Amino acid sequence: EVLLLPIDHQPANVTTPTLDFTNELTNWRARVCELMKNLVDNQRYQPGW
Amino acid sequence: VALLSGKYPPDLVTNVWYADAIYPMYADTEVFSNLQRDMITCEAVQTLV
Amino acid sequence: TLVAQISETQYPVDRYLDWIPSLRASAATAATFAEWVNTSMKTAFDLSD
């Protein structure tokens, strides 16, 4: 009587804020973007620019 | 791209939308025919052995 | 002030129109409503930019 899923699920509600970091997928996007800042913040890894 | 650009219709009601989707879908259902076919398949293999 | 009457915000405000029925509003609904407010004020004060 079960159907497995590869992600987490929650009850349906259309009044959910867009920037809700409780959401796993939204949180994933924020974490990746934050890392890319640290990579290009001090120009340590980008000579020749 | 699909993960970064998605939007609902500005006037959406879940009850209305899914009522109009299930009815055409369930009208042409074939589970009842499929159940009868499954009986024959199991009945046949036991005859073979 | 107007958006807070159809959604939930962080600003204190009084509500005088709740007996009038309304739908559950998503981000798409709020964006569409705000466009009409923006257009109305532009016409009133004769602005094109």
Side-chain angles (χ1 to χ4, degrees):
Chain A
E1 74 276 12
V2 71
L3 186 84
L4 311 167
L5 285 164
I7 56 160
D8 177 40
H9 87 283
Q10 291 304 307
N13 190 0
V14 299
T15 78
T16 297
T18 59
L19 293 175
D20 184 18
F21 286 177
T22 302
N23 191 312
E24 287 191 321
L25 275 298
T26 290
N27 191 9
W28 182 248
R29 156 154 58 83
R31 292 291 190 271
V32 165
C33 283
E34 276 326 292
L35 177 71
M36 281 195 99
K37 291 182 177 66
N38 294 352
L39 195 144
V40 305
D41 189 358
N42 59 5
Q43 203 181 4
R44 152 165 176 187
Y45 307 107
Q46 279 93 26
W49 277 4
Chain B
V1 172
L3 271 166
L4 291 165
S5 47
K7 68 181 178 67
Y8 287 176
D11 46 324
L12 178 63
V13 170
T14 62
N15 299 274
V16 175
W17 176 282
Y18 278 121
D20 284 12
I22 286 151
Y23 170 57
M25 185 180 288
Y26 275 19
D28 197 336
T29 188
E30 293 177 353
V31 290
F32 296 97
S33 296
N34 290 324
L35 286 174
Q36 302 203 326
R37 203 184 145 73
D38 286 2
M39 183 278 288
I40 294 300
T41 300
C42 182
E43 183 67 26
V45 296
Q46 186 70 15
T47 303
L48 180 62
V49 298
Chain C
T1 317
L2 296 176
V3 164
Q5 317 277 320
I6 63 152
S7 180
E8 314 291 337
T9 61
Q10 76 258 37
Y11 297 102
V13 69
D14 46 7
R15 294 162 149 274
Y16 300 99
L17 308 161
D18 277 12
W19 46 284
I20 305 176
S22 170
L23 77 163
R24 314 200 65 210
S26 78
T29 299
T32 298
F33 184 75
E35 272 164 37
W36 278 82
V37 166
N38 179 21
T39 306
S40 297
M41 294 182 286
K42 254 153 76 162
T43 294
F45 288 101
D46 177 346
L47 300 167
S48 57
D49 63 358

